[PDB]
Amino acid sequence: YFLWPTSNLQHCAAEGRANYFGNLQPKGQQANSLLDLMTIRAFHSKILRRFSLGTAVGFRIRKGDLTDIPAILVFVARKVHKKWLNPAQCLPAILEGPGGVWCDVDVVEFSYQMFSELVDKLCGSDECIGSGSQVASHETFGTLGAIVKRRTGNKQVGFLTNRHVAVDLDYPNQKMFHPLPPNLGPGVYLGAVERATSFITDDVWYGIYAGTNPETFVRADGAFIPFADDFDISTVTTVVRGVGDIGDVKVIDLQCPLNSLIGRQVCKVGRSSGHTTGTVMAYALEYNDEKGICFFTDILVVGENRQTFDLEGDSGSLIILTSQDGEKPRPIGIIWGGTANRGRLKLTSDHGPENWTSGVDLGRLLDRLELDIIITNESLQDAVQQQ
Amino acid sequence: YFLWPTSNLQHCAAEGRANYFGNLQPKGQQANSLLDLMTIRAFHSKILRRFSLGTAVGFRIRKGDLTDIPAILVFVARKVHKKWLNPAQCLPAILEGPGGVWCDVDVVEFSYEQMFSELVDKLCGSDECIGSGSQVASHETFGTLGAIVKRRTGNKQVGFLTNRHVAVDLDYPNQKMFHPLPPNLGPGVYLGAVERATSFITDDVWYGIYAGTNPETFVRADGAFIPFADDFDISTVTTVVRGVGDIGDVKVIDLQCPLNSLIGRQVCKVGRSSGHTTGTVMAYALEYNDEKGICFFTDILVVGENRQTFDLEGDSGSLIILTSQDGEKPRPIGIIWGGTANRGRLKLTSDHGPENWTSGVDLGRLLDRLELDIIITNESLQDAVQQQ
Amino acid sequence: YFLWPTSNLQHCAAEGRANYFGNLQKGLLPRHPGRLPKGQQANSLLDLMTIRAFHSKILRRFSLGTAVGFRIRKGDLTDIPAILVFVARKVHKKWLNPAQCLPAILEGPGGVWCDVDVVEFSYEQMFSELVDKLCGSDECIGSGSQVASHETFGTLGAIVKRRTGNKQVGFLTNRHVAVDLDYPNQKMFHPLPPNLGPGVYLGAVERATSFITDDVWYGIYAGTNPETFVRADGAFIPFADDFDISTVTTVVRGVGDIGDVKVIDLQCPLNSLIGRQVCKVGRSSGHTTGTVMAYALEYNDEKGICFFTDILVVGENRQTFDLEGDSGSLIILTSQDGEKPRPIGIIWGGTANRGRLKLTSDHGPENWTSGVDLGRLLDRLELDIIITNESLQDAVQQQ
Amino acid sequence: YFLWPTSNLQHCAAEGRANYFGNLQKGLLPRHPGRLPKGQQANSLLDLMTIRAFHSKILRRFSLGTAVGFRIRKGDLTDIPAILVFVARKVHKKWLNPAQCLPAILEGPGGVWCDVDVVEFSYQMFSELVDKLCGSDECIGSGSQVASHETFGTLGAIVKRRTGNKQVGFLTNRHVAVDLDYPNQKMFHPLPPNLGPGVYLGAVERATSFITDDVWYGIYAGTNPETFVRADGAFIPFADDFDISTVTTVVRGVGDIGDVKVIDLQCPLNSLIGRQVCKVGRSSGHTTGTVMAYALEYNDEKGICFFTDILVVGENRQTFDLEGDSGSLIILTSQDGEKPRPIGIIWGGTANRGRLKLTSDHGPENWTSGVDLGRLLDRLELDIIITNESLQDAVQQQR
């Protein structure tokens, strides 16, 4: 018994969005934050969607390296010289949005098992369940992202993993086991999915009109599972194995400087690939997936030293910023997985394309789900008694 | 976001079910209604699912014909003579449930592309009006418009009712419906989007009783409601079920009313794929034998008459209608359930082969969990058109 | 622990065959004339085999196989002794180079002759009261009842009894129903094995035969190839010690009480087997009727081995005679003069089992069915067929 | 004519097997739950098998099979007698309900006890030697490729028959030298005539598929009344016209080998378990490995229980065999100063080649199954020939 919106997604906010764009229509103070870059792309969403496989915001990638030039990333199937494009297809080097603020436009060529002691510990060989532990429904396997606790209601303690790992269609309930479901091997029952989110409109997720398409949604796939009534929550640790103690979530501020997210180093620990490291390359990837529907996904990561950042089954690991000042590493997202048709991007000519990985903004996901992540075992036992 | 139960399905309502069976634990007062048959089957559900392909309630089937004997139907893969069964596998002819009430138990052999007529063409866009039986398509699947309904609570907008997995996908953030074809495949008018749908409902809120001892028991209630779009001409919507005529209001399936008013009755439906077909109710409350650790129920079981299959793929959403036996308006009692994959039959006589049976959803109960009231006349339609 | 022959299938007895044919055509010559007199005509199956065997090199030269019987002309079986030669696609004489066309007459050893005609040749369920009764809905087991191993379904041929040893009573079905290779035991159930449904345990396969050389089966050298075998697949299962034999009947439902086996004599006149009407009752297609069309069907494969099959049946009134799963049914001669119907074979099941052949041009291709000589199989397995319920209890006791 | 038992594998020896378990009541009064005398620790494979057999009821409880040998701890073989229990995925004790956790010690009848270990379990090469083994060499020996008209394999050893004519031949496992469509099984090196050049080696005179546990080991190795040993092996005598002078007994890449080392169930454990073995095969050349277990148990899909004798894993992370090595002679490395002796032949194939997890720093590793040569040579009545001179003696002693 679900409910979509009744008539408020057609000609009350469909022309209300066209009003924000219907109204507002050279050395000038170039864009400083993601908030500026997103608006520039949104205004030009017609000529940018005209020939592209998708767009994103970040820094311009020049001769294989990330620059310090704020730019809108435009993805194409095959990058060719300017000599093989009819004039309708070539893109300008610079765009101007509302209010004179500007940015660059560069082209990026784009397309849509490990064995270690740590991988075994995450797959049931350890004596504790935490971030990185394998979590499985009756069909698919995944990764437990983070220990969270509910804000309203019972204030029940549970964990957070992304959608399509913990939810299937034919089954009427979604039970989760570690490390295997009973129909496949041994495992302990963790609980069931109480509430999860699939799609959120851009204005409620980002706060702005990230596009002119009246049907624009955000791939915010994330699920919350409260620990079962008869489950021993004392076997849960908050130590991110292989990383250590982590801090609280740093929200992705659209107004802070660009290079505080773009280019920063991130790492994760996953069920399938252990501890891998990567670099954030873009933000707010736009659909260019023709159905008339516009989809967004927040984080885009690429692995370091040409090694892939994730594998199939890592869906649900915690995307964690590596410590730059000896502080506690703080998470900003959780790795999203799907659909498994995997996709590459081309950086250099002496090497082939490299696998990129998408993620969901943790700061925004924890808010629309009303959850607070637990960072130490002492603060955990507090929420255990609040139940 | 969604909202599933927090701790209310494990050892709060699991002991309320375990109590109903913990507490309870011939010669005249035989079962009279579906409620009696369901309780007897539920109490003996442990020793019944032990060797069976499924169970259902209804009348005993002897030599291919429905008798007047209330009985619990037990489905097997292949029926053999009593001489080849060890006594642990043979089933008793009579069961006695709680309170001395009893009933019979008989065995039924059981197992789990388009017609061409002027009526089928009218349903696929050749007519000048959209109604029950008209083809409704998303960008992926085809279906059948079941009935014109209107929402009771909230606003009062008029729309139509079709079953789920025609109107719902997982990837889309909205599900648009078109007649007779989606824009990406041919011509068509926009009908609207799916406002709400239900997939599974627990037995205790659906029937009102504990139909089984399995703590995880659900009802395959796949059905969706679509409000007509702002730019759609609601004047092209008719309430006449083509091939049947003007229909009455929903006949609710009362578990307490006498058996022979539903079991055995003659039924018909009009669908996108097979037009106007006739059939017979054979059982009720068919349970799962589907090995997911889950116990699934389906309310109506229909078999086509004169050896011809009752439905085909694409009929999903058709209105199951009781034929008029006294002269009143024919009344709907169910809507055809989807799936139609895995193609499963039942064997009635030995001189003829198996026949295809069709699943349905109880219309009277589904219209309440979706908060809808069916409209049967054009004047009653124009009322809801202005009541918006 | 299986056992093949010792060295006796290479040289010695192998050349023993070569000699029997090396004797002839060192010592056998027609005179001049090719207007051969009609007293030397082939009269029996044995005569036709000797002509075919001697001429096997030119017969398997361009052919899909050969067989002996009556000439088939314009869709009707005649009473003319002939060697049937099978081809892939039959064409007019004008499109054949002289090396491929076949002579109308062959002259075998001793002047004996016969005709040669050409036939173009190639290699889902019923619903009736009888088929259900045969598949476990009846209260008695007999001929035609469904018998199943853990993989495949079949048909019980006949109630038989062993000659030597304990003399235990059992039933007869063909090998490809009752034998698989992964399993170390062969359990048989009616109508279904426990891993598929309900059923009663009938017993296990005690003893079966797969291939027999032509000289041990027929008694003659039916071909010049030293590696020549007969597809004699048949298996014997004794009823279990704890089985209730009181539910076993010998009445072939739809046929009645049958007589004793009529052995196929290679020397008797042709028309006592060729052309005779036969019928069977099977698990998969019930009671169908057909007609014997040939005998000793020969087929050489791309490995150098020569295979034989005894009976060739085609269904009557263009209805197919059998379906897949009918493997093991009893081929019974219909009673012509009020006498007891007698069985002559059992339906064989395999890869070269259900091919098609074209008889008339106004009708499509028709399915032929293979069989094994019942009289000869009962000797290789040392079994005697039981025909009445009283004759059963007599044999039930002597274990 | 095929044969199987009549009433002796059904309640003759099924109560005889149930008897063994029932002169084993053990008192209905238990041991003391503290210490145990170390004179009762398992010393031989025979002791380990009986302990495993008695507890077979609780061992099938959430496990896919068992075997006997030494405990494998943190990736290394110890010398501690233990019963290996195979699981689908090994997990911590914290995720097991008490019905699934396994005891560290088991005590059998008569006080004998042992450890219980857990193992995670699941069910070509180009070199100068491999070319010589595949027809580029001028001599036939152990390791040379042997092929039927369908499949390729590896010649195990030059053997001679014990009874009868006493004919010289070679030994390979059954699924390499035996097919079921063919009525004969011809062997060629290196290719059959339908695929390439090759010389005719001979035909299969005898083969074995399954042997009951009581006749194979000498004891009742399990509680299941239907228990068999996968003893697939076939014997081919050299053809009548074949040149046996090109046959050598020198195992190329190993050297001259000694006589067969019989697997004594009563001798000390560590003389088989843990010993180093090597083989030369058609598909993977000369590889070396380590014996890891014995008497591998498996129940599938009916009441029927299958056993396999030898379990080997390759050394230094290299796989021990590949497909096509089926039939190679597995030889333990040199008896300390003497000549290496063979103990088995690689079975190879359908389900008998799976993986097992040893360390977390490495992925899974391929294990290879084998059958006891000492026991296989007895059911087939064959004697292994070890030198070229001893071969020429029996060649003319043939009858």
Ligand SMILES: Nc1ncnc2c1ncn2[C@@H]1O[C@H](COP(=O)(O)OP(=O)(O)OP(=O)(O)O)[C@@H](O)[C@H]1O
């Ligand atoms: N629609 C298009 N489809 C394909 N290729 C295009 C399209 N528009 C532009 N290009 C190509 O992309 C080039 C622009 O590359 P870009 O802006 O990324 O350069 P850069 O960042 O300075 O350096 P580099 O490409 O070495 O990283 C154009 O010169 C042209 O060849």
Ligand SMILES: Nc1ncnc2c1ncn2[C@@H]1O[C@H](COP(=O)(O)OP(=O)(O)OP(=O)(O)O)[C@@H](O)[C@H]1O
């Ligand atoms: N578990 C079972 N599996 C298969 N067949 C069974 C099983 N239990 C009983 N039977 C068969 O079902 C028969 C009884 O069938 P049933 O109860 O349907 O009889 P009925 O309704 O009086 O008549 P009819 O056969 O016409 O339906 C038994 O005689 C037995 O042969």
Ligand SMILES: Nc1ncnc2c1ncn2[C@@H]1O[C@H](COP(=O)(O)OP(=O)(O)OP(=O)(O)O)[C@@H](O)[C@H]1O
């Ligand atoms: N090698 C061959 N391949 C194909 N067709 C052949 C071959 N040899 C002969 N034929 C054809 O077969 C014909 C002989 O047919 P056959 O002996 O069956 O005649 P029939 O019995 O008198 O009549 P009918 O053709 O009506 O049965 C030849 O006329 C020729 O067309």
Ligand SMILES: Nc1ncnc2c1ncn2[C@@H]1O[C@H](COP(=O)(O)OP(=O)(O)OP(=O)(O)O)[C@@H](O)[C@H]1O
């Ligand atoms: N049924 C079972 N399925 C899966 N795992 C099991 C089962 N029973 C026990 N285990 C696991 O197997 C472990 C025993 O491991 P094992 O006997 O191999 O120990 P070890 O040899 O001392 O050390 P190591 O595990 O490093 O080889 C138990 O601690 C438990 O985690």
Ligand SMILES: [Mg+2]
């Ligand atoms: Mg660039």
Ligand SMILES: [Mg+2]
């Ligand atoms: Mg009945």
Ligand SMILES: [Mg+2]
């Ligand atoms: Mg002819």
Ligand SMILES: [Mg+2]
């Ligand atoms: Mg260990």
